[PDB]
Design a protein around this ligand. Structure first.
Ligand code: ZN
Ligand code: ZN
Ligand code: ZN
Lengths: 87, 81, 238, 99, 50, 61
RNA sequence: GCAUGAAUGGCGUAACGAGGUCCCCGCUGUCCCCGGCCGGGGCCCGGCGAAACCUCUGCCUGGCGCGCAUGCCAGGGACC
RNA sequence: GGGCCAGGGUUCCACGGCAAUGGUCGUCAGCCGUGGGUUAGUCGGUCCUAACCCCGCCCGUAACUCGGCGCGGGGGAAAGGGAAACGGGUUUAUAUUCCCGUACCGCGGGGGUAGGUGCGGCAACGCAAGCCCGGAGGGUGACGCCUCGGGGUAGGCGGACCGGCCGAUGAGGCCGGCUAAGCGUAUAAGCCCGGGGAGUGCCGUAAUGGCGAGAACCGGGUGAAAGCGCGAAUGGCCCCCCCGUUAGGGGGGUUCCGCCGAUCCCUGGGGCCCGUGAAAAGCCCUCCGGGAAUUCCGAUCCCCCGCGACCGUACCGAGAACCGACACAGGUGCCCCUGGGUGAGAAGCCUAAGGCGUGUCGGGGGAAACCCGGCCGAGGGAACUCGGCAAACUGGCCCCGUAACUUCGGGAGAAGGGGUGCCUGCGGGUGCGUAACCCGCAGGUCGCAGUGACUAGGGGGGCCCGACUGUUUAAUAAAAA
RNA sequence: ACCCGAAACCGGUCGAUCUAGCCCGGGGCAGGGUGAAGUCCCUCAACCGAGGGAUGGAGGCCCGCUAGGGGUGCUGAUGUG
């Protein structure tokens, strides 16, 4: 294979073609999952995917419908309670 | 786990000398125990890096000694303050 | 003859230049204008390991939006609040002028001149002790055992530097030393001048002995200051 | 034309496999690897311990043993007292712990 | 090489065009005095200046 | 070593390539200057009196 | 102790070594004492076909001689 | 053997040739003559930045094309980051580029719609969920080494059935039984959301472990690789029949169960650091400010139309296409990948696929002596030699057994002893299994020899030196240096 | 200064594709053995103790014609290769 594909940043799959010839398909690895800003726990409702997959989706299909979608539920509730008490 | 003297220094086999192996084993045995956390007060503190310790229950992380969470100088300054 | 290691180090070649891009950055105090006459609150966000520092470092975010990197004192807690200024309470992690620090206190990261950012007591596990306070100078005992006078307006942090006792354990392996010194690009392994050729070292020669006393004058020229430089004495003190 | 492949045959290998299944070609003189290389250690422990845990859970579900008995047998299995479910059942019958 | 720059490719093309024999009509016109030129080249023996 | 086997490692990037200014294959590519005419290092041509190379060009030696 | 010696370290030392050295079991063609066999050269035949080197030459015994001569002196041999 | 960088630069393809080249000949050729051949919105460069480098100001220098800190600008990776395409066919030579079929991304445009002015859940969350300009924050890009569990996929094996070839037109063996991107679709681990209120404690893993700072347990949310449906049989593959003077035309099939299973993918555990294992571009979300919208404005949602520039693209890729003067036994590139048997094994041996007979001079022969590379040698067994140099002994696996010394780790596979083939039947472990892998037992039997070939340690006791792993005179010194 | 021959000395320039060192970004190391810390369990007694069995995978550890790297002996062959 080419030196560019010799890199391990590509995942390689062996497939057999409908014409009966075996081919090597290379794909780019998917990113990790989003993590909470404060405690670093994984978030929910945010699909993984490379930029093209992320752009393939609508706005409401890539984040939860609640305030502060960048924090996990404990952190979201805690921040709002603190803000209300301070106010 | 059933070794009379080598302790954690048993990975070296018959190398590096008695005094070196003893001092390694003593330091590592003291470091690898479970230490009381200063926040939740439970023996669930482990070293994550040189001079950085973290509690495995409440998650509080602090800076301490290279091989022990607290040193004599730290204790002295804490009592003085 | 040929050059010495010390002579070659002065030309700043990559063999001797420090790799100041693996590190997290210098740890200097915020500008004196903020700290003088005002006291600022800050929150500790993270504590991490600096490749070449000998001490852990910490990230602090202050109430005015300024982010800074500091040497973490022993016992510092992530998420805690620290104060910098003349009115800061006497507690570990607080920075304030030496005039406001009571005697008998342990301090670190002392400023040589007001606003210079800190030069003294920065290694891991080190501290200095405040001895006496006067209207024109504050006496501090340094880790080396010297009593140095600082301007009263010089700033210092309360506590001891984290990472002490690092020398208790052996470096068991040549490979352990290899990694330790490669982290900062220090010349390792080192040769012995007595085993070089006469062209390379003053002590070089076929015989592996120095042909001259190893105490060299303080007035010797470059390329000759080897061995014990301007030594007051040598040997074991009884 | 395109000549057909000279396909290799596996008839003798099939016969040898049947004989080995019966128990032939397996003596000391036909062994080259170490006994552990032939029957790995961690894999064997995994098989046996998972089997023991499954059997204990099945017994508890069927109500043949109580919670205390299940707990005691669980710690015993972790400790490695039982090398197989046959020995586990022998222990059960011997101590009369099976209802 | 698989990947080439255009300028180098053009220079190689000029050398390739240069590498050819003298025309027979040139030989007969010159009366056999001109039979070769100094730019003749064999790929495996004489290598390009670049 | 140091002989025949050493010359087999000449398959890396060439040290010198063609120079846009003087047209000679002397352009140090890694450093970025010409070892013949000084292109990329100076505005004026690299000419030295101990060198007869620039006289050979115009048969003026 | 011609002329060792304590950090140009002294003494000892488990483990380690394509380091140096002595001995023992076993083994053997190292040896007594060398003999068979196999493949490739060597040899012959058909092709392609150089190089190092070269004052001209080119038998010996006793000699003279810049003291150790194919070439000189006296003898002896020598068909190509 | 297959794919392909760097380097080479026409060596690639067809026709016509053999004066020269080719270690011989040659009708052949990487050779000589003639004519041809490299088609991109998707693959690379182009974009970002890393180590680092350059110009301008500034300082120094007699001066500079010279040395240099700071500020401003720029460059810097064809194996780092980084929008989008895969099947079939076609040519003597190009194809992810050409033709047919089916897709995707960027920009602009047109008609609708969601929304501006909307909902379901206690919640995690499910949703098409307004437009434009500027800014801030979060996530992602974005990351070390060692070790293990779980879920898949390539490939492989055994059985049934259909077609064909060999075989006695017996048993039986082998060959084919295929399936891309794209589009729609779900769970696993992890994490989360509600109920629940434990301790003479229960719960769980391969292991470490978790619990009043909330366990057992009952419901759920989000979440990969994969599989599944369309793509898709009209395509590819095997076979059969009629026309057969060239030249052609039709009919069948291409279906299932059970295992092993990756170094190839996805996902979680755990451990180590006096060692901490990149940056920016880009992309997604949220939040703030500003600007238009009501017989109006208007999409991240469906349908459709138009446009997508420049350069590389042939070929070898090496025991003949590169470097070494060579069609050099070296080096670069073994840089990436690998059916069956035996077997622990990517070992040795045999063999399928693919390749080759060009590691390119042939013929003769008891056709010698002698030299290099191998096999055996009676009796003795180092008497040889500076010196057991060379060769020889041992050799895999199971069981028993194992010394001085010691830094207690080791020495150690010490030493030494016994067994090993094939055949006929049982027992055992995990397993649904008479699937697959592994572990014992009894009996019969042959040879000089059962790790029968291949693979495959000889051992012990004193002394000197250096603690050990490691490095050294590339080309006479590997050592106590 | 009849002609030829030196080892060497000085000036400015060219070289890290070989090789030495360091920095940035990347590829590779079949199979097996031994078994460190950590974590445990079982049986009899209990005034003390005694006797067994696991699990876990560290090492500049071990055997190894895996790949890759090195170059001790034959002072083997070749030594106008
Ligand atoms: Zn959170
Ligand atoms: Zn805690
Ligand atoms: Zn130039």
């Amino acid at each position: 294979m080419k030196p560019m594909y010799r890199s391990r940043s590509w995942r390689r799959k062996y497939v057999r073609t409908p014409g009966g010839r075996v081919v090597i398909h290379f794909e780019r690895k998917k990113p990790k999952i989003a993590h909470c800003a404060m405690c670093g726990r994984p978030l929910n409702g945010i699909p993984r995917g490379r930029p093209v997959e992320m752009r393939k989706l609508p706005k409401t299909k890539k984040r939860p419908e609640r305030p502060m979608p960048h924090l996990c539920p404990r952190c979201m509730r805690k921040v709002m309670k603190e803000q209300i008490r301070a106010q | 786990s059933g070794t009379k003297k080598v302790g954690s220094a048993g990975r070296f086999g018959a190398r590096y000398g008695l005094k070196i192996r003893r001092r390694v084993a003593a330091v590592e045995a003291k470091m690898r125990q479970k230490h009381t956390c200063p926040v939740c007060g439970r023996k669930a503190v482990k070293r994550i890096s040189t001079g950085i310790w973290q509690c495995q229950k409440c998650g509080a992380t602090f800076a301490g000694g290279a091989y022990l969470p607290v040193t004599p100088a730290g204790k002295a300054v804490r009592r003085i303050t | 003859g040929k050059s010495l290691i010390q002579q070659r180090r002065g030309k700043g070649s990559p063999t001797f230049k420090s790799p100041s891009h693996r590190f997290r950055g210098a740890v200097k105090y915020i500008p004196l204008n903020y700290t003088q006459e005002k006291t600022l609150r800050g929150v500790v966000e993270e504590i991490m390991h600096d490749p070449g520092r000998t001490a852990p470092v910490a990230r602090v975010k202050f109430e005015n939006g300024i982010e800074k990197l500091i040497i973490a004192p022993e016992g510092l807690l992530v998420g805690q609040e620290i104060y910098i200024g003349p009115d800061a309470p006497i507690a570990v992690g607080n920075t304030l002028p030496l005039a406001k620090i009571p005697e008998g206190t342990y301090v670190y990261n002392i400023e040589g001149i007001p606003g210079d950012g800190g030069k003294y007591v920065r290694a891991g596990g080190t501290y200095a002790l405040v001895v006496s306070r006067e209207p024109d100078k504050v006496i501090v005992q340094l880790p080396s055992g010297e009593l140095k006078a600082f301007n009263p307006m010089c700033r210092a942090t309360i506590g001891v530097v984290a990472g002490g006792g690092r020398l208790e354990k052996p470096l068991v392996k040549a490979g352990k030393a290899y990694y330790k010194y490669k982290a900062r690009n220090k010349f390792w392994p080192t040769p012995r001048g007595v085993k070089m050729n006469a062209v390379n070292h003053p002590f070089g020669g076929k015989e592996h002995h120095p042909g001259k006393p190893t105490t060299t004058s303080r007035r010797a020229p470059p390329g000759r200051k080897v061995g014990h430089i301007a030594a007051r004495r040598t040997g074991r003190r009884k | 034309k395109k000549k057909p492949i000279k396909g290799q045959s596996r008839y003798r290998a099939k016969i040898r496999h049947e004989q080995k299944k019966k128990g032939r070609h397996r003596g000391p003189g036909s062994r080259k690897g170490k006994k552990t290389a032939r029957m790995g250690k961690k894999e064997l422990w995994i098989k046996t311990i998972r089997a023991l845990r499954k059997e204990l859970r099945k017994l508890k579900a069927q109500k043949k043993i109580d919670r205390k008995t299940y707990r005691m047998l669980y710690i015993r299995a972790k400790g490695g007292q039982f090398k197989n479910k046959h020995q586990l059942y022998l222990f059960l019958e011997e101590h009369g712990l099976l209802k | 090489a698989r990947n080439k720059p255009l300028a180098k490719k053009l220079r190689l093309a000029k050398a390739l065009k240069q590498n050819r024999r003298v025309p027979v009509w040139v030989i007969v016109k010159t009366n056999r005095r001109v039979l070769t030129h100094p730019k003749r080249r064999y790929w495996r023996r004489t290598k390009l200046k670049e | 070593g140091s002989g025949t086997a050493t010359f087999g490692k000449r398959n890396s990037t060439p040290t010198h390539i063609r120079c846009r200014r003087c047209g000679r294959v002397s352009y140090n590519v890694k450093k970025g200057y010409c070892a013949a005419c000084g292109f990329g290092r100076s505005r004026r041509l690299r000419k030295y009196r101990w060198s007869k190379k620039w006289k050979k060009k115009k048969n003026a030696h």
